[PDB]
Write a protein that binds this DNA or RNA. Structure first.
Ligand SMILES: [Zn+2]
Lengths: 23, 71, 83, 129, 218, 98, 208, 129, 83
RNA sequence: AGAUACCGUCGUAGUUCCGACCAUAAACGAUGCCGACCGGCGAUGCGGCGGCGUUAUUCCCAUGACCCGCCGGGCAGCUUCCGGGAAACCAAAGUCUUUGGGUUCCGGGGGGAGUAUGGUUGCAAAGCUGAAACUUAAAGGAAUUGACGGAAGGGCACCACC
């Protein structure tokens, strides 16, 4: 679905920001 | 829906100098990153040795094994 | 509309409306020629002659066919009586 | 107990009563024999189904002329009813109502005809919203 | 042969109206096709623009009806364009011609801008459109030939229009539209109030008046 | 596309109208879109009216009506069969049914 | 419209009109129809200029008489009020009347159970005698309609502003119109009453 | 608001000619507009018009005639160096045989054929045909 | 074709248009006189008043501005449109 | 079957209030602003105007409430081939090859993507600005015929039931 896709990709970014705390 | 004025020649001009970039037939041919990723240096041809000989299949509608080379 | 010698090389001269001077086309079908008889104005009997009119197919669709026959008839001395 | 007689029977019967309306009657048995004489009916059964509609259709015509057939003895009845002529009643013999502004149209026409005057200008009721 | 069902056909079979002019002035409908063939059987050269098969779905085998585009012309001042559909390409191609003859309309040929010799082009910039196809006709000098796609290069030619520039709108692939438009434009020559015109016309007793004395015959 | 020029709403020239809960499933529809009904009914419906006349103390009694204003959500409405789909030309007319 | 004792408006004719209420129209005015409405009284119904009716009813007469052959004009009525009248008009003139339901396509569709090509339509009512007003576009047909104060004036050449709801009003003018189209061709000296009364053209159920 | 007061007047008659009216009124007036319509009237494209006067602006009434096909306006007011004039009257006109384009000029407002004889140029106003 | 004169319309159609949309615009008001109840010093007063007026000949109010037209306290002689 | 779902009894955050952040929604009329013109009609809101009767008062009178119309500016409606459009539809989505009233923003086949990075605002959630490599011959809008519906409306059949 169009929106739930936008939730995954918004969730997925927070993974990417969080693994710059590690460096 | 237009400028169409008589002292507006700059706005009709700095608009088209801006909206040309969305013509992918022009963005490719005028941006340095498009030619850079070309394995040719923009050349017509390019020599090079053969380092193996491999075959590759065909898409779904019709089957075959097209022959190729890893130059 | 002419020639080198001035001859009128043309198939015909199409009829023209009597309220808008528009050209009734060769394949229009709502456009009509109409005839209004005369009377000798001494006995009322049909005096032979005819009054010709035309209306383009656009007018009749707009409903102004009669309002244009009327104004043409008042000007040409067919109806002269006022309100 | 009975069926819809298809367009074969309905069309065949309506012409018979339209062509021999005087030689027909009320009773089926009379009509069965008549139809055979005046029509070449291919089948015994349908002749008794055509004669069935004819006697049913005559029971119709004696009860107010209907919209199917043309009967000369019934048509001449209409023309006497459509050409009737009494002494004129369209003329509206003397004084006949005219509304107050109607005579003003007439006096603008310059007619001195005689008629009635009412008063109606006070408006008290008209169309509904 | 040909006994008519129209007053015009009654008046036409007997030689009493001579040309399509007198039929076109009063814009009388053409209800039979034999009328034109009596006037214009010679040089009415047939052609087949396309035969497009169209298919309508059904619970049973998907049905197929063919379409026939036929234009008719004379290179002297008339053009037609007929269409038809039927379940056999022999009758569709036969029926298209008859419907093409009925739709025959007169075309006016003018000069580029120098006024010596025979007319050779469209009088002025005419246009038309059906289904977004917009065929413009732009006057051209003598002796250039027609410039257009092969489809309307024919419609214009059958008119005798020797030299006509043109310019077309997008989506011309469908001959049902691109031919219809270029036919619509050439009909639109006798629809301009040109300054060459404006001479008052005198209505001249449409054939039904002058020829009613015989036309009450039975 | 556009099935209805009204979008199904009765809102023209304003912002948003207050939403009224459905009077079956409690779905929150705005007061415009909802299908409103106003049913007046005797409390003593006809299957028993005369059986009450026999047992009535008073000589003249009228058995007062009952007044409830029902609002239906679109989904709760079609299913209960108040309304139905209609043909794209008969869709236009808005006069209440006879 | 004219300068005659027999062409201009006569007291005898005006008494006919006011008798059958031709002057009362309806409650609505169509913007093409303003030029034939005198005033509106206070109950809300329109009064027609009976003189203006005369010009048009004389103009329409001058249209019909110009037609060379009487059969060439098809007079058409599709309301039960004037069905009998239009039969009478063809009887006293020589027209080809059309009463009853208008078979759609009697002027088109060559291969027709009923087919005519006339040169002039005469329709009782522009609203309910609908189709011939529209089939008078696919072939070149002039039109003559007894237009009310509410009827559309589309596809009509001559508009006779009159009341046409009542039976008396329509029956009158078919007798009236027939009288004018006949006279200009010759039946009497024009200095006589025409020996047929309007009641012949009036609507009437069997009532003894 | 109103900017090109020539443009609005021409669209007011063009929309009124399309319908088929005989007379049309335009709201503002100017020498630029009066000297405009006179160019048409000097060719017979329109009838004979009147110029209502006020203290405020003036409002022209025109007696239209069924002879003009379209009466456009061209803005902004360009230039015509008499070498571009043949380009303009080929991408803005129906044909060379008829139709004229009017362009203002140091010797008054005049249609292009006047410009060729007086051998001058100047800014452009509009066109008709 | 709805061809009607915009130059010479009836003096009664001109009241069927706005104050501005007429042929030549003119105000809908009219200057009126008033006889100042109880005294004979006759003063001018504008029909569409937006201010009261007080009379030394009355010591009571004369015109009362309500809406877009005045209402006079007591009837008086009212000349009009001498302008 | 699974049901960490629909269903039902509980129940934290939350819902409401005062003081600050956030600046996003199919925030929709999916339809920029201002200005002009081209059809009718019956009503609706507000203002002023002309009106004959009634009703509130004992008095036109001040004024309401009804009843008939006009004018301006609104929310909207019905109808028409003015005219547009791919068409559904539109008095604007009209005045558009017969193109030019003035002006702002913005789109160039679909996907990768509103992703990576860089700048910037934010307490956080996030918002604004925002690519390419590569991949693909079609993605996509409106109508037309069928098929299909655990979609409604009629009706028939013991290869259907009662
Ligand atoms: Zn619900």
């Amino acid at each position: 679905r169009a929106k739930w896709r936008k939730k995954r990709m918004r969730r997925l970014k927070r993974k990417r920001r969080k693994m710059r705390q590690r460096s | 829906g237009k400028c169409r004025g008589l002292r507006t020649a700059r706005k009709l001009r700095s608009h088209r100098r801006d909206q040309k970039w969305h013509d992918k037939q022009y963005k490719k041919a005028h941006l340095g990153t498009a030619l850079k990723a070309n394995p040719f240096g923009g050349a017509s041809h390019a020599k090079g040795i053969v380092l193996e000989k491999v075959g590759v299949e065909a898409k779904q509608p019709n089957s075959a094994i097209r022959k190729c080379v890893r130059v | 509309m002419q020639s080198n010698a001035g001859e009128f090389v043309d198939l015909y001269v199409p009829r023209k409306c009597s309220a808008s001077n528009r050209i009734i086309g060769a394949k229009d079908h709502a456009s009509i020629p109409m005839n209004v008889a005369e009377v000798d104005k001494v006995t009322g009997r049909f005096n032979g002659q005819s009054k010709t009119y035309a209306i383009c197919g656009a007018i009749r669709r707009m409903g102004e066919s009669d309002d244009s026959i009327l104004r043409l008839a008042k000007s040409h001395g067919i109806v002269s009586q006022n309100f | 107990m009975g069926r819809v007689r298809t367009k074969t029977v309905k069309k065949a019967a309506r012409v018979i009563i339209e062509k021999y309306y005087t030689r027909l009657g009320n009773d089926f048995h009379t009509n069965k024999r008549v139809c055979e004489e005046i029509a070449i009916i291919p089948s015994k059964k349908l002749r008794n189904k055509i004669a069935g509609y004819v006697t049913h259709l005559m029971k119709r015509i004696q009860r107010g002329p209907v919209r199917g057939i043309s009967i000369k003895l019934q048509e001449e009845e209409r023309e006497r009813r459509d050409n009737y002529v009494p002494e004129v009643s369209a003329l509206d013999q003397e004084i006949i109502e005219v509304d107050p502004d109607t005579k003003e149209m007439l006096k603008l026409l310059d007619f001195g005809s005689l008629s009635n005057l009412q008063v109606t200008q006070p408006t008290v009721g008209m169309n509904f919203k | 042969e040909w006994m008519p069902v129209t007053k015009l056909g009654r008046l036409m079979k007997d030689v009493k109206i001579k040309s399509l002019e007198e039929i076109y002035l009063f814009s009388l409908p053409i209800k039979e096709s034999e009328i034109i063939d009596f006037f214009l059987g010679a040089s009415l050269k047939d052609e087949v623009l396309k035969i497009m098969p169209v298919q309508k779905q059904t619970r049973a085998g998907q049905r197929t009806r063919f379409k026939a585009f036929v234009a008719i012309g004379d290179y002297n001042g008339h053009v037609g364009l007929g269409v038809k559909c039927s379940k056999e390409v022999a009758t569709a191609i036969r029926g298209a011609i008859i419907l093409a003859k009925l739709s025959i309309v007169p075309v006016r040929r003018g000069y580029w801008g120098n006024k010596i010799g025979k007319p050779h082009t469209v009088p002025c910039k005419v246009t038309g459109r059906c289904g977004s196809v917009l065929v413009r006709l732009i006057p051209a000098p003598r002796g250039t030939g027609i410039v257009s796609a092969p489809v309307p290069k024919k419609l214009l030619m059958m008119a005798g229009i020797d030299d006509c520039y043109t310019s077309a709108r997008g989506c011309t692939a469908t001959l049902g539209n691109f031919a219809k438009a270029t036919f619509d434009a050439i009909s639109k020559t006798y629809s301009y109030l040109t300054p060459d015109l404006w001479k008052e016309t005198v209505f001249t007793k449409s054939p039904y008046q002058e020829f009613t004395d015989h036309l009450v015959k039975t | 596309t556009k099935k209805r020029r009204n979008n199904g709403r009765a809102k023209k020239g304003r912002g948003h109208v207050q939403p009224i809960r459905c009077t079956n499933c409690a779905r929150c529809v705005p007061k415009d879109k909802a299908i409103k009904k106003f049913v007046i009914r005797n409390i003593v419906e006809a299957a028993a009216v005369r059986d009450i006349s026999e047992a009535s103390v008073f000589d003249a009694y009228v058995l007062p009506k009952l007044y409830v204003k029902l609002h239906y959500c679109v989904s709760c409405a079609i299913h209960s069969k108040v309304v139905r789909n209609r043909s794209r030309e008969a869709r236009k007319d808005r006069t209440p049914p006879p | 419209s004219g300068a005659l004792d027999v062409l201009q408006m006569k007291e005898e004719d005006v008494l006919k009109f006011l008798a059958a209420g031709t002057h009362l129209g309806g409650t609505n005015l169509d913007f093409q129809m303003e030029q034939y409405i005198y005033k509106r009284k206070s109950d809300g119904i329109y009064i027609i200029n009976l003189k203006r009716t005369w010009e048009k009813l004389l103009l329409a007469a001058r249209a019909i008489v110009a037609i060379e052959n009487p059969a060439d004009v098809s007079v058409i009525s599709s309301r039960n009020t004037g069905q009998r009248a239009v039969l009478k008009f063809a009887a006293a003139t020589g027209a080809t009347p059309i009463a009853g339901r208008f078979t759609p396509g009697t002027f088109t569709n060559q291969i027709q159970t009923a087919f005519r090509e006339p040169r002039l339509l005469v329709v009782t009512d522009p609203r309910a005698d609908h189709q011939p007003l529209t089939e008078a576009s696919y072939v070149n047909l002039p039109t003559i309609a007894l237009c009310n104060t509410d009827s559309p004036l589309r596809y009509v050449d001559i508009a006779i502003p009159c009341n046409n709801k009542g039976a008396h009003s329509v029956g009158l003018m078919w007798w009236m119109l027939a009288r004018e189209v006949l006279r200009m061709r010759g039946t009497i000296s024009r200095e006589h009453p025409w020996e047929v009364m309007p009641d012949l053209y009036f609507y009437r159920d069997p009532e003894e | 608001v109103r900017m090109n007061v020539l443009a609005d007047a021409l669209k007011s008659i063009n929309n009124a000619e399309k319908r088929g009216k005989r007379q049309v009124l335009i709201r503002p007036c100017s020498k630029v507009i009066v000297r405009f319509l006179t160019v048409m009237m000097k060719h017979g494209y329109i009838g004979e018009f009147e110029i209502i006067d006020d203290h405020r602006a003036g409002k022209i009434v025109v007696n239209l005639t069924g002879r003009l096909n379209k009466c456009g306006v061209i803005s902004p007011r360009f230039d015509v160096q008499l070498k571009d004039l043949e380009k303009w009257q080929n991408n803005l006109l129906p044909s060379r045989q008829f139709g004229f384009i009017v362009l203002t000029t140091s010797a008054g407002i005049m249609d292009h054929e006047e410009a060729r004889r007086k051998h001058t140029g100047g800014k452009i106003l509009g066109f008709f045909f | 074709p709805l061809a009607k004169d915009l130059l010479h319309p009836s003096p009664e159609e001109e009241k069927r248009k706005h104050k501005k949309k007429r042929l030549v615009q003119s105000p809908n008001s009219y200057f009126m006189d008033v006889k100042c109840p109880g005294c004979y010093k006759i003063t001018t007063v504008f029909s569409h008043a937006q201010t009261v007026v007080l009379c030394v000949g009355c010591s009571t109010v004369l015109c009362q501005p309500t809406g877009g037209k005045a209402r006079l306290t007591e009837g008086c002689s009212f000349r009009r449109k001498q302008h």
